């Protein structure tokens, strides 16, 4: 997502577009996994899991 700023969209627009996808965050205090909204460092997600 960070390559997309300064080229086609602005920084606020890419940060608003990255929130719509969920990504794997490292698990919390209990051990069960969590999900997080995406930030600018993560890659654009594919539509199929495998």
């Amino acid at each position: 997502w960070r390559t997309l700023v300064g080229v086609s969209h602005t920084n606020e627009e890419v940060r608003n577009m990255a929130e719509e996808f969920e990504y794997d965050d490292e698990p919390d205090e209990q051990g069960n996994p969590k999900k997080r909204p995406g930030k600018l460092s993560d890659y654009i997600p594919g539509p199929y899991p495998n």
Binding site: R2, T3, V5, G6, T10, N11, E12, L40
Partner: protein, 76 residues
């Protein structure tokens, strides 16, 4: 007039060098120091710390080094 001796005395030396040579080498050595410092200036110009300290304090050529792309468009 008759001279039976010499009026001469040995100068100061360290075998390889003597002050006879160094009083002539000193202005060109200062010019070589200036040339080497200019070479350091040109070879270390992409350095950002030296860019903001020295290479932007230059009066007319200075602001050409800045690209103030707004903070609305940078990833970091």
């Amino acid at each position: 007039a008759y001279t039976s001796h010499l009026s001469s005395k040995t100068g100061l030396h360290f075998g390889r060098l003597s002050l006879r040579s160094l009083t002539a080498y000193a202005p060109n050595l200062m010019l070589w120091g200036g040339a080497s410092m200019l070479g350091l200036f040109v070879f270390t110009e992409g350095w950002p710390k030296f860019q903001d300290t020295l290479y932007k304090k230059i009066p007319l050529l200075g602001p050409t080094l800045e690209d103030h792309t707004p903070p609305e468009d940078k990833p970091n």
